Design a binder for this molecule. Structure first.
Ligand SMILES: O=C(O)/C=C1\SC(=O)NC1=O
Ligand SMILES: [Zn+2]
Ligand SMILES: [Zn+2]
Lengths: 193, 194
């Protein structure tokens, strides 16, 4: 099982999210209380990288999904047979991969040769001049409710900062529900608190 | 074997809807929300609504299949009685043995499962028509619930499955059906017992 241990490391690495609220219109919304992203199938999911100091040249940013529950943790998170077969290809992402990056031609996809785990990795870019974080646009290409895939099992996304050799510089994670109405679903889930 | 009747809204938030038709003597098809049961007349239009949270892709298909509701009858294939099988009511498309037809759709496809021998009818999924928030399929039930040598008063379920162009299951819903002479009266009577 991949480690989900939070690690700010030398560069003070943590994640940020847009403060989007729970209006019906929202495409993507993050719950601080639940540490949970609510997002729509194949829609922009902004994830912010915050550092106290610039990581070195060739630093990379990897995203990987795991099942949150102990009893499912060893099962590779992948798209359902249906979504794997859909003609929704961007010409870059493998059809089995849940997590894509949109708007980055330097994106790289891995099928791990030992663990069979899927991940997507981009070069780390510092913030645009006058900005305090780096934004990556993730797309989740299966719904949480898909039979043959996640089938309502909650997942975590693990974001790792690595050097050009793959050495760990930093790690953070958040729960993800891919759903039709993130706004309503977030508000409903926070009601139970 | 027995086809699954387990409700599955799945990726597209798939639910069934029915017209709020009431129980006047003139109604040909009326649904009881309390019983989740359709009452309809032999060979008459039965609107079944498909509700989705998101539009399934092109090539999506919608399948209807009848199974007996009671455990002791579940393994028996639901088919028309000898009399109705021999009625000259053919539309050129539906096999004469099939209980469930679709009317007004030249893209309708009928299956005799080579392994289970189960009957099903499938149509292309189309997005909701103008003035509607759902997709309506017009089903016809071609044998009465009371028919001796067929269902013979045994209650049936219709299972509606949403599948992609490759036959992957996207969603499943079901409802009980009674095919009868006076659906309105029979709905009132069966709701009285609540
Ligand atoms: O046409 C026939 O000879 C038999 C049929 S047609 C129909 O709907 N009901 C009947 O008893
Ligand atoms: Zn899926
Ligand atoms: Zn009959």
């Amino acid at each position: 099982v991949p480690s989900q241990k939070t690690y700010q490391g030398s560069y003070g690495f943590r994640l940020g999210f847009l403060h989007s609220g729970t209006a019906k219109s929202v495409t993507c919304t993050y719950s601080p209380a639940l540490n949970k992203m609510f997002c729509q199938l194949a829609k922009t999911c902004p994830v912010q990288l915050w550092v106290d100091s610039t990581p070195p040249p060739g630093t990379r940013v990897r995203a990987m999904a795991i099942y949150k529950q102990s009893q499912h943790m060893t099962e590779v998170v992948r798209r359902c047979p249906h979504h794997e077969r859909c003609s929704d290809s961007d010409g870059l992402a493998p059809p089995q991969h849940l997590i894509r990056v949109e708007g980055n031609l330097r994106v790289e996809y891995l099928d791990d040769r030992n663990t069979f785990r899927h991940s997507v990795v981009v070069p780390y870019e510092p913030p645009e001049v006058g900005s305090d974080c780096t934004t990556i646009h993730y797309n989740y290409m299966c719904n949480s409710s898909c039979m043959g895939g996640m089938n309502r099992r909650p997942i975590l996304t693990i974001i790792t900062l690595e050097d050009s050799s793959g050495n760990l510089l930093g790690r953070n994670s958040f729960e993800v529900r891919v759903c039709a109405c993130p706004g309503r679903d977030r508000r409903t889930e926070e009601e139970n608190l």
